[PDB]
Design a protein around this ligand. Structure first.
Ligand SMILES: CCCCCCCCCCCCCCCCCC(=O)OC[C@H](COP(=O)([O-])OCC(O)COP(=O)([O-])OC[C@@H](COC(=O)CCCCCCCCCCCCCCCCC)OC(=O)CCCCCCCCCCCCCCCCC)OC(=O)CCCCCCCCCCCCCCCCC
Ligand SMILES: CCCCCCCCCCCCCCCCCC(=O)OC[C@H](COP(=O)([O-])OCC(O)COP(=O)([O-])OC[C@@H](COC(=O)CCCCCCCCCCCCCCCCC)OC(=O)CCCCCCCCCCCCCCCCC)OC(=O)CCCCCCCCCCCCCCCCC
Ligand SMILES: CCCCCCCCCCCCCCCCC[C@@H](O)O[C@H](CO[C@H](O)CCCCCCCCCCCCCCC)COP(=O)(O)OCC[N+](C)(C)C
Ligand SMILES: CCCCCCCC/C=C\CCCCCCCC(=O)OC[C@H](COP(=O)(O)OCCN)OC(=O)CCCCCCC/C=C\CCCCCCCC
Ligand SMILES: CCCCCCCC/C=C\CCCCCCCC(=O)OC[C@H](COP(=O)(O)OCCN)OC(=O)CCCCCCC/C=C\CCCCCCCC
Ligand SMILES: CCCCCCCC/C=C\CCCCCCCC(=O)O[C@H](COC(=O)CCCCCCC/C=C/CCCCCCCC)COP(=O)(O)OCCN
Ligand SMILES: *OP(=O)(O)OCC(C)(C)[C@@H](O)C(=O)NCCC(=O)NCCSC(=O)CCCCCCCCCCC
Lengths: 178, 88, 459, 103, 128, 603
């Protein structure tokens, strides 16, 4: 989510992703902790018996039969964490998230309540206003010609600088706003 | 709900608690900044299992792209804090 | 009837002699007063009619249409106030003049006692609408839209005129009372078949009938908000009123001349409804829903039974109010976003909750939730159709389901989900918009308490 | 594997800014500045205003307006068993046919 | 060996079962790299427009405009009367009408004959 | 005068006062949920009085108070039928609603829109009362559609979640399919009986034909989620747990069975429709119990249990025992609502975790929920002398001794066994093992709201069957004499299901693992019905809606026929007429030609 993606997944990443998926589905099959521990140790032993192999061709022939075997026995109803994309509370609090800019449209009788909050908000706004003019040029000179090659962003390198394109990441609504 | 507002100290304590129950790593050697591959001599599969234990401990899942580059307890704590919006 | 006509005419000098900053206030106040005056036409008899003079008469079919026509004008003024802010005083006065002339032509058309007079005013309603569409429309398609809206209409109505004068050379009169009292059967003949087609096609094309409906989406998506309101709420019902009036001289030919249209309607209501399932424009979706409802009205009129006529009248009134409200909601989104695409502005319930409530009530009314008068008309038409043939229920039933789907679809895409992140110019709803929605929706729920007012002369 | 130094530094800067922003979301002790201006007991008032008044209105409406019209309130006829007597007339319904009783 | 998964239109092939991801060539890597490059360029453009303090309006998306235009207004100028389009139009627009006409006409003829012979039992049928 | 009618109308009327006050100052405060809860408790207490009057004598009433309109010979008026069914169902619904509102006061404490949520619950209760007390078909349709709209609004409570909106639209779709049959029945009765009033319909229909009864059966199958239209009920578990306990468990989903019960005089005169109802109920109960047997979400298990119980109710209707079906409705209300409250208590105590894989030893950790769920599971399986006994045991006996399908009877018995099996599954995987939840233990039962709300329905699910059965008049001939093995059949199959489920669940501890079989995959994916039927039809509809109706016909061929052809022909004729070089040579040659033609053609 936070990390920028690459152009492709290497062989090691694919193997590790299979290992995690297989362990999770084995846990979903083996409900009890001791049974899961036993079969997960067995799966670890099965997984690293080809850990030391050198050639790419058969190492890719493995992890293909492994995917087929996983898809045959994949527990059609695996356990999902409730906040995960398949969980029972995935986007439950999405309706309570309100953008910050809505506060700019409040009535003055509403802003009269919470004066300290809005003073701090004005401070944040002026900080953003200066930092943006710096950030545009920083990104302009830090980018290779022909455009970006990866959607990864640089940090700030000067003293009073801020990381380019920081406002909408720092001012996230919240995980549970209401 | 009635969930207590966990803090950075609680997250660090729980991460270290889970790591000290991993018998592959010596409880004397590890620290908050102790690296996984170089400081403790662990593998990539061990790192995957550590991430899974963290996920089981804290009740939420870390995506694989983010999980694959969490190589210290301190960065695990930082990731959990950023995800769960911990102030102090 | 002149107690309503003369003040409507006096609206024009009042508009033109008004101050530059007081046109909207005066127009709205006096239009509301004219609506209050026209409310007195609702006192109808179970006997013939309210025959005021030789030129004008009122019926319990004409009275609700007249009340709706007079009530729509203040709402149109309120809806037009916003997007006409940067317009010169003379052009704003011209816009209000077009609206007033349209109201005058409609008022007279509903109450005219002569078929020729009715034809003249029925065509006179075209010029203000065409000017409104092609002058104050926004996109470049408006010109083409206007052309369609014109020629389709004329292509249907030029034969009617011929038929009309022919009838007056045979019966000797085109007065509706004499025509009703001296009715004679139409024998099955080729000449009679073509007379039937000439008398029917002009009203079919303005409903619009499926297959002759291509002008309506263009005109409704290209018109300004007041034009869309008047087109969907009143101008569609002119064809229904005309067919209700003229079918008295077409029997017993209608017994078998109605088959091609009935099919075209019964299948057509399916197609248009399904079209609403895959639409990327809000106004286009609302226009196609209007086509489906008017197909049901066409079936009701062709069935020619008391329950059919009652249901058709009730459905005409209900659809007018509901479609006007839906167009106003879509326009209140458009004036903020300037796109008219459904999936651009999303999750608006979080940013505008009361407008989301208005959206819900409008969608529920379009969905025909009992005991709304929408469902009253729909159910009466469905029962009459079931008596006509028990198989019709299948198609009718299907339509019901489909309607609900697309209605809720429109409610879910725009109001629910997550808000669009980059859209940061969605301001709080103004009192004008909320009052517009309230003045649309309160009369519907009030009318459900006294449905006999909108059930027509066969109640 | 792991973070690149630039990714690490950007993450620390972003998280410091985010922690500051989250800390700025707290309210001061006086923050909700509320402007004041005006112009068995609870169960008793609840029973008076939510039960007694509606039942009075409904009983009046039923007793003096609804029943003023025929067939508005139609009652199921009470059941009559042998040996009963009628208030209106006063006759006694005869008993049954003394069926042979055993077990 | 295990029983094979057979993909369909409404149940597509898993990415982990694609042989195309196991046939890696330098040209494939270059294609992936340039796809990521164009995605990164579009993301940078959007994020520059999105984080700008000065901007106070909906960001215009050319892709969305192209989608709506292609779905609505680009249809007819690219229409060509072909045997396939002619046949499909005739079927889908004419066949249902005559099918329903036949069904309803047969039903009403049956009902009318029953009424004329008097054997229909329309007792209590007062409202129509 | 005769306080029966005044009391019956007052209950429904005072149910509406908080809706009027929803715009007052109480709605903006935090006392509104308690206001609504107190109003519902008062309404329950008031409605207890006409039930006592009916129990003493048998009081029955029709109240046609407001005349709505008159279409010639058809008079539509606001009429209420205060019969046995109404005066028995209203107290039960009010009792369950009071318990659910007290539970929601604790469950939804951190929800910002709790006032709106309470208001929504009261609106559903009002619509359901309108449905239950209606005397004509139009008022019944009003309640029918009101409960559906409230279900749509409460399923999609969290409107930022895509799945909730999808589930709400799914419920609307299936209930619209049922609405087709409802409208069919209304049209038939208006055309043939000249009435929507129930009395005239009963008078004029001594041998009811197939069409209106088939329409009624379609509506009942739609609203009670029978096998053809079943998946929306399990999909409706997207809503908050109180919504699942109130609407989609015990009160709203029994509306189709209620509709079939209301029209039972016409149903007993038709044998084909009775057989159709029997087969539909049997297949529904079997299929839903089979699906429930392998589920891992606890709310899904309870929802499939509700669906199977509804199928059993329809089986009871099919064998011409409507009063037994009403009794089962009343008992199921109690114990199913309490089961859902216990499940919601567990879910809240485990940090909104719903999977039974992640709940272990709760028998000792939270004892009150354990006892309540144990008593509810015993009541659901028809333990003798409990609330479910007095309905389920009689239903099983009646199906055993009746002239009916052998297949339907076998399916009913197998479904009873499967009911015992999934009750065993819930208990075994939620209470008996070692803990399998995250280390931070936040388990807490000590809230008086939760305890009292659960305890009232506990007392109900223990004693209500005995009280109600002994206090109602006999409405059917009893099955006094029976073979001994036939009398014990329900108990025998329940014990066999218990034993087999326990034996199969005890093997999950063995250190062996194997891949699943085809039957397990069929049971886990709900017979693959949601997959195919939610992917093949919808796609083929939507695709057509774009390819043929919109593009081919509307945008191309209808455009080609009338306007484009006219434009093309007129433009070609204009080019033909106006393209003249301006040479008098050709003009005067043409003049000569026309002069000759006029000379030699028109004379
Ligand atoms: C039911 C009995 C009620 C009795 C009490 C009095 C009720 C007065 C109702 C007035 C008429 C409707 C007004 C609509 C405009 C609302 C304006 C507004 O913004 O209010 C905000 C105001 C302040 O809230 P807020 O904090 O600003 O809200 C923030 C957000 O916007 C969040 O807002 P929200 O989420 O609160 O949204 C508002 C809320 C409620 O808003 C609405 O939905 C309004 C429209 C609902 C109906 C839609 C059309 C359906 C066809 C109706 C035809 C019958 C009309 C009857 C005559 C009406 C005369 C006007 O949404 C819903 O709850 C969904 C309603 C679904 C109803 C489904 C069932 C309908 C039929 C019921 C049967 C009726 C006949 C029974 C016959 C048999 C027995 C006699 O809240 C309210 O006032 C809500 C009122 C409660 C809803 C009333 C629903 C019942 C009444 C229906 C019509 C009248 C029936 C009379 C006979 C009753 C017996
Ligand atoms: C008349 C004399 C009366 C006395 C009768 C005899 C008394 C009783 C004798 C017992 C007889 C059998 C009872 C045991 C039930 C089976 C248990 C079992 O072994 O399951 C494990 C075993 C494999 O499971 P697994 O892969 O290891 O699961 C992985 C873990 O265990 C995952 O585990 P988990 O933790 O996730 O969940 C465990 C769950 C998961 O287990 C499952 O997968 C569920 C599947 C098994 C239960 C299904 C039983 C319902 C049968 C209804 C069938 C209706 C017709 C449908 C037709 C289908 C047509 C395609 O299992 C359970 O919860 C317990 C299962 C049920 C036990 C409690 C009730 C059983 C007694 C009720 C039935 C008989 C008494 C009725 C009383 C009335 C008196 C007659 O399941 C099977 O192999 C199925 C066995 C029987 C299925 C027959 C259907 C095959 C159809 C193939 C096609 C044939 C040709 C058709 C051509 C058609 C052309 C049009
Ligand atoms: C395009 C989008 C839709 C627009 C609206 C469409 C609605 C208009 C449809 C016109 C209605 C039908 C017109 C005539 C119906 C009369 C019945 C007759 O046609 O059927 C048979 C007639 O047989 C044949 O039809 C003879 C005519 C055949 C030639 C007509 C052309 C057929 C298709 C043309 C369709 C073109 C429509 C569009 C024009 C641009 C009956 O046999 P018969 O008993 O002997 O005649 C009875 C009539 N009598 C008593 C006067 C003698
Ligand atoms: C409340 C506080 C005020 C208390 C003072 C009043 C106390 C009772 C005195 C009332 C006097 C009697 C009265 O109300 O007048 C009768 C009058 C009826 O007028 P009629 O002409 O006799 O019949 C209708 C046909 N014309 O009754 C009423 O209007 C009041 C009672 C109406 C019932 C409540 C209506 C609620 C439902 C709204 C309509 C919903 C849509 C319709 C659904 C139809 C279903 C089939
Ligand atoms: C026998 C004669 C019958 C006469 C029928 C009269 C039909 C009335 C419309 C005639 C318009 C014909 C002219 C025309 O459309 O030209 C094609 C024109 C080219 O664009 P221009 O503006 O001319 O040039 C722009 C570039 N500088 O294309 C268009 O714009 C088409 C838009 C107008 C069509 C609108 C709909 C008209 C047809 C609707 C159906 C009614 C047909 C009436 C007769 C049908 C038979 C009963
Ligand atoms: C949206 C576009 C729709 C276009 C209009 C479609 C309707 C066309 C209706 C026919 C047009 C002419 C109507 C005639 C006016 C009625 C007068 C009448 O009925 O008198 C008849 C005359 O009837 C006719 O002459 C009609 C002949 C038709 C000539 C014009 C052809 C127009 C096109 C015909 C086919 C299309 C009609 C349906 C189109 C469907 C929609 C596209 C009797 O004449 P007599 O000789 O005095 O009496 C006989 C005893 N001696
Ligand atoms: O040091 P790390 O970076 O952690 O590297 C780890 C490792 C060296 C093992 C790996 O990344 C790697 O690079 N290996 C090189 C060769 C290689 O891995 N070849 C492929 C081996 S495939 C395999 O491990 C067999 C899979 C068997 C398990 C099948 C899963 C089926 C489960 C079914 C559902 C329960």
């Amino acid at each position: 989510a936070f990390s920028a993606p690459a152009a492709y997944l290497t062989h090691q990443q694919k193997v590790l992703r299979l290992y995690k998926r297989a362990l999770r589905h084995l846990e979903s099959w083996c409900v009890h902790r001791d049974k899961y521990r036993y079969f997960a140790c067995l799966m670890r032993a099965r997984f690293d018996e080809h850990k030391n192999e050198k050639d790419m061709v058969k190492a890719t022939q493995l992890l293909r039969q492994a995917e087929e075997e996983f898809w045959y026995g994949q527990h059609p109803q695996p356990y999902i964490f409730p906040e995960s994309p398949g969980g029972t509370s995935y986007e439950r609090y999405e309706c309570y998230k309100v953008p910050e800019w809505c506060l700019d449209d409040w009535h003055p009788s509403e802003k009269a309540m919470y004066p300290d909050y809005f003073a701090k908000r004005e401070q944040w706004k002026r900080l953003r206003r200066e930092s943006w003019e710096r950030e545009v040029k920083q990104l302009q000179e830090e980018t290779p010609p022909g455009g970006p090659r990866t959607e990864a962003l640089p940090p700030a390198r000067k003293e009073g600088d801020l990381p380019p394109l920081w406002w909408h990441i720092v001012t996230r609504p919240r995980e549970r706003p209401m | 709900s009635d969930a207590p507002p966990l803090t950075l100290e609680a997250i660090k304590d729980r991460v270290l608690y889970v790591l000290k129950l991993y018998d592959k790593i010596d409880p004397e050697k590890l620290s908050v900044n102790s690296h996984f591959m170089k400081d403790l001599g662990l593998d990539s599969l061990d790192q995957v299992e550590i991430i899974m234990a963290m996920e089981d401990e804290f009740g939420f899942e870390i995506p694989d792209i983010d999980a694959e580059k969490l190589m210290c307890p301190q960065e695990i704590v930082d990731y959990i804090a950023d995800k769960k919006d911990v102030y102090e | 009837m002149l107690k309503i006509i003369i003040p409507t005419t006096m609206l024009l000098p009042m508009t033109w002699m008004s101050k530059h900053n007081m046109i909207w206030i005066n127009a709205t106040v006096h239009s509301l007063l004219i609506s209050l005056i026209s409310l007195s036409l609702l006192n109808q008899l179970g006997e013939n009619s309210l025959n005021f003079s030789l030129t004008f008469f009122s019926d319990s079919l004409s009275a609700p249409l007249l009340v709706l026509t007079t009530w729509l004008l203040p709402l149109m003024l309120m809806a037009s106030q916003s997007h006409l802010s940067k317009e010169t005083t003379t052009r704003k006065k011209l816009y209000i003049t077009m609206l007033i002339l349209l109201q005058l032509f409609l008022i007279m058309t509903f109450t005219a006692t002569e078929l020729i007079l009715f034809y003249i005013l029925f065509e006179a309603t075209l010029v203000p609408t065409l000017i409104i569409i092609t002058r104050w429309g926004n996109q470049t398609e408006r010109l083409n839209a206007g052309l369609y809206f014109l020629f389709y209409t004329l292509a249907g109505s030029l034969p009617l005129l011929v038929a009309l004068v022919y009838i007056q050379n045979t019966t000797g009169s085109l007065n509706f009372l004499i025509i009703h009292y001296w009715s004679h059967p139409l024998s099955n003949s080729w000449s009679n078949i073509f007379m039937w087609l000439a008398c029917i096609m002009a009203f079919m094309v303005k409903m619009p009938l499926y297959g002759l409906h291509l002008w309506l989406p263009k005109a409704h998506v290209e018109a300004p908000i007041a034009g869309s309101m008047v087109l969907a709420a009143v101008l569609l019902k002119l064809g229904g009123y005309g067919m209700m009036r003229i079918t008295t001289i077409l029997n017993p030919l209608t017994n078998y001349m109605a088959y091609p249209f009935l099919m075209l309607s019964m299948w057509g209501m399916i197609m248009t409804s399904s079209i609403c399932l895959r639409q990327t424009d809000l106004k286009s979706l609302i226009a196609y829903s209007s086509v489906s409802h008017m197909a049901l009205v066409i079936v009701a009129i062709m069935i020619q039974t008391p329950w059919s006529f009652m249901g058709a009248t009730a459905l005409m009134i209900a659809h007018g109010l509901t479609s006007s409200m839906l167009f106003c909601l879509a326009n209140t989104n458009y004036e903020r976003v300037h796109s008219r695409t459904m999936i651009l502005a999303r999750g608006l319930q979080t940013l505008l909750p009361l407008m989301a409530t208005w959206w819900l009530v409008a969608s529920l009314t379009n969905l025909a939730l009992p005991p709304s008068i929408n469902l009253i008309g729909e159910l009466f038409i469905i029962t009459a159709s079931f008596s006509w043939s028990n198989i019709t229920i299948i198609l009718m039933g299907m339509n019901m389901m489909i309607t609900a789907l697309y209605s809720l679809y429109m409610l879910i895409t725009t109001q629910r989900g997550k808000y669009t992140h980059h859209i940061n110019n969605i301001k709080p709803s103004f009192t004008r918009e909320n009052a517009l929605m309230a003045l649309h929706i309160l009369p519907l729920l009030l009318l459900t308490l006294n449905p006999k007012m909108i059930l027509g002369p066969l109640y | 594997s792991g973070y690149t130094p630039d990714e690490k530094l950007r993450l620390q800067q972003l998280r410091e800014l985010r922690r500051r922003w989250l800390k700025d979301q707290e309210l001061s002790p006086r923050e909700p500045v509320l402007p004041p201006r005006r112009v068995t007991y609870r169960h008793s008032i609840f029973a008076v205003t939510h039960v007694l008044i509606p039942v009075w209105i409904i009983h009046y409406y039923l007793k003096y307006h609804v029943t003023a019209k025929p067939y508005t309130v139609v009652e199921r006829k009470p059941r009559i068993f042998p040996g009963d007597t009628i208030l209106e007339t006063g006759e006694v319904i005869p008993l049954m046919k003394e069926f042979p009783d055993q077990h | 060996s295990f029983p094979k998964y057979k993909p369909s239109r409404l149940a597509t092939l898993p990415a982990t079962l694609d042989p195309a991801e196991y046939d890696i060539s330098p040209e494939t890597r270059k294609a992936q790299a340039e796809r990521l490059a164009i995605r990164s360029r579009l993301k940078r453009e959007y994020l520059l427009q999105y984080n700008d303090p000065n901007r106070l309006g909906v960001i215009e998306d050319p892709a969305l405009i192209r989608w709506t235009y292609a779905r609505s207004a680009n249809i007819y100028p690219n229409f060509r009367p072909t045997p396939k389009t002619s046949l499909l139009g005739a079927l889908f627009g004419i066949g249902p009408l005559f099918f329903w006409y036949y069904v309803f006409k047969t039903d009403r003829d049956k009902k009318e004959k029953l009424i004329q012979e008097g054997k229909l039992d329309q007792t209590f049928n007062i409202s129509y | 005068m005769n306080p029966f009618a005044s009391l019956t109308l007052t209950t429904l009327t005072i149910l509406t006062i908080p809706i009027m006050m929803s715009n007052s100052n109480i709605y903006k405060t935090n006392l509104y949920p308690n206001y609504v809860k107190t109003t519902v408790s008062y309404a329950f207490t008031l409605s207890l009085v006409p039930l006592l009057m009916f129990m003493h004598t048998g009081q029955e009433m029709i109240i046609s108070n407001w005349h709505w309109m008159t279409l010639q010979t058809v008079e539509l008026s606001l009429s209420f039928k205060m019969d046995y069914f109404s005066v028995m169902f209203i107290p039960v619904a009010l009792f369950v609603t009071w318990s659910i509102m007290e539970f929601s006061m604790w469950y939804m404490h951190s929800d910002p829109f709790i006032n709106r949520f309470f208001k929504y619950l009261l609106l559903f209760l009002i619509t359901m009362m309108i449905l239950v007390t209606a005397n004509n078909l139009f008022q019944l349709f009003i309640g029918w559609e009101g409960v559906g709209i409230m279900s749509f609004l409460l399923i999609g409570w969290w409107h930022g979640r895509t799945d909730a909106n999808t589930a709400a639209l799914q419920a609307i779709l299936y209930n619209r399919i049922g609405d087709i049959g409802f409208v069919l029945s209304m049209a038939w009765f208006l055309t043939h009986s000249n009435a929507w009033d129930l009395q005239q319909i009963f008078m004029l229909n001594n041998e009811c034909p197939n069409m209106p009864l088939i329409g009624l059966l379609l509506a009942a199958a739609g609203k009670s989620a029978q096998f053809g239209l079943h998946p929306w009920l399990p999909s409706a578990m997207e809503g908050p747990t109180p919504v699942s306990a109130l609407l989609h468990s015990s009160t709203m989903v029994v509306a189709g069975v209620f509709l079939l019960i209301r029209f039972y005089p016409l149903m007993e005169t038709n044998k084909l429709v009775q057989t159709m109802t029997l087969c539909l109920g049997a297949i529904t109960t079997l299929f839903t119990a089979l699906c429930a047997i392998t589920q891992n979400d606890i709310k899904k298990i309870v929802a499939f249990s509700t669906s199977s119980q509804l199928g059993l109710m329809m089986v009871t209707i099919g064998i011409n025992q409507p009063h037994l079906a009403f009794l089962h409705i009343c008992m199921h209300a109690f114990f199913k609502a309490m089961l859902f409250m216990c499940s919601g208590s567990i879910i809240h105590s485990l940090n909104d975790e719903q999977d039974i894989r992640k709940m272990g030893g709760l028998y000792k950790a939270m004892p009150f929920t354990t006892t309540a769920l144990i008593i509810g599971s015993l009541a659901l399986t028809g333990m003798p002398y409990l609330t479910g006994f007095y309905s389920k045991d009689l239903i099983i006996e009646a199906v055993n001794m009746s002239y009916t399908n052998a297949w339907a009877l076998l399916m009913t018995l197998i479904a009873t066994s499967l009911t015992a099996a999934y009750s065993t599954r819930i208990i075994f995987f939620a209470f008996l093992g070692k803990p399998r939840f995250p280390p931070l233990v936040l388990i807490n039962e000590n809230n008086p709201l939760l305890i009292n709300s659960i305890k009232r329905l506990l007392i109900g699910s223990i004693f209500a069957g005995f009280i109600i059965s002994n206090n109602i008049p006999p409405m059917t001939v009893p099955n006094t004499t029976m073979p001994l093995y036939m009398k014990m059949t329900a108990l025998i199959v329940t014990i066999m299901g218990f034993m087999l489920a326990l034996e199969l669940n005890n093997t999950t501890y063995y250190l062996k693992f194997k891949y699943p079989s085809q039957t397990y995959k069929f049971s886990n994916m709900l017979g693959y019905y949601p997959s195919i039927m939610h992917r093949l039809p919808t796609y083929h509809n939507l695709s057509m809606s774009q390819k043929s109706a919109s593009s081919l016909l509307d945008l191309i061929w209808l455009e080609t026929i009338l306007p484009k052809t006219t434009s093309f022909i007129q433009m070609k004729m204009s080019i033909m007429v106006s393209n003249q070089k301006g040479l008098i040579k050709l003009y005067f040659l043409s003049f000569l030609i026309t002069i000759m033609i006029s000379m030699t053609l028109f004379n």
